[PDB]
Amino acid sequence: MKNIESLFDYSAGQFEFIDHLLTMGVGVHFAALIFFLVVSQFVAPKYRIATALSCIVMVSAGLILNSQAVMWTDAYAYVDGSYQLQDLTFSNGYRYVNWMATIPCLLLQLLIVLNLKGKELFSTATWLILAAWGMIITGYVGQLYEVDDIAQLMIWGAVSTAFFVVMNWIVGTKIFKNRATMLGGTDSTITKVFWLMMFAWTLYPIAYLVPAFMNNADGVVLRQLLFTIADISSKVIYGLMITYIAIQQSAAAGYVPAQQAL
Ligand X SMILES: *C/C=C(C)/C=C/C=C(C)/C=C/C1=C(C)CCCC1(C)C
Where in 61-120 is the site for Cl ion (CB under 5 A)? 61, 98, 102
Which entry of ligand OLA, ligand OLC, Cl ion, none binds 244, CB below 5 to 8 A by partner kind? ligand OLC
**Given 84, 161, 178, 259, the residue binding ligand X (CB under 6 A):** 161
Sole binder of ligand OLA in the list 60, 161, 215, 233 (CB under 6 A): 161
Report the half-sphere exposure of 142 (CA within 13 A, side-chain side). 25
Count the alpha carbons within 13 Å of 12 in the hemisphere toward its beta carbon. Answer: 4
Rounded Cα–Cα distance for residues 6 and 21 (Å): 19
What DSSP designation does 5 have?
A: G
8 A C-beta contact, residue 164 and residue 219? no
- Would you count residue 234 as binding Cl ion (CB under 5 A)? no
What is the DSSP-derived secondary structure letter of residue 2?
Answer: -
Tell me how far, at minimum, the Cβ of 23 lies from ligand OLA, in Å: 5
Beta pairing partners, 84: 77
Residues that bind ligand OLC (CB under 6 A): 31-32, 35, 39, 42, 123-124, 127, 158, 161-162, 165-166, 168-170, 172-173, 176-177, 240, 243-244, 247, 261
**Footprint on residues 102-131 left by ligand X (CB under 6 A):** 102-103, 106
6 binds ligand X per the rule CB under 6 A: no
CA 183 to chain centre: 27
What is the rounded CA–CA span in Å between residue 262 and residue 259?
Answer: 5
Spatial separation of the C-alpha atoms in residues 124 and 45, rounded to whole Å: 21
* Residue 7, burial from CB neighbour count under 10 angstroms (0-12, 13-18, 19+): middle
Contact of residue 152 among ligand X, ligand OLA, Cl ion, none (CB under 5-8 Å per partner type)? ligand OLA
Is residue 168 close enough to count as binding ligand OLA by CB under 6 A?
A: no
**Segment (H or E) for 90:** none
Q: CA-CA distance, 32 to 54, in Å (whole number)? A: 9
Residue nearest to ligand OLC (CB): 172
Work out which of 60, 66, 67, 259 binds ligand OLA, going by CB under 6 A: 66
**Contact stretch for Cl ion (CB under 5 A) within 21-29, 56-64, 125-133, 185-193:** 56-64
Q: Does 67 bind ligand OLA (CB under 6 A)?
A: no
Nearest Cα to Cα of residue 244 among 69, 43, 3, 33: 43
94 contacts ligand OLA (rule: CB under 6 A):
no
DSSP-assigned letter for residue 115: T
What is the distance between the alpha carbons of residues 196 and 252, in angstroms, rounded to a whole number? Answer: 24
121 counts as binding ligand OLA under rule CB under 6 A = yes
User: Residues in the site for ligand X, rule: CB under 6 A?
Assistant: 99, 102-103, 106, 135-136, 139, 157, 160-161, 164, 201, 204-205, 208, 231, 234-235
User: Residues in the site for ligand OLA, rule: CB under 6 A?
Assistant: 19, 23, 26-27, 30-31, 34, 38, 46, 49, 66, 69-70, 73, 108, 112, 121-122, 125-126, 129-130, 133-134, 137-138, 141, 150-152, 154-159, 161, 205, 208-209
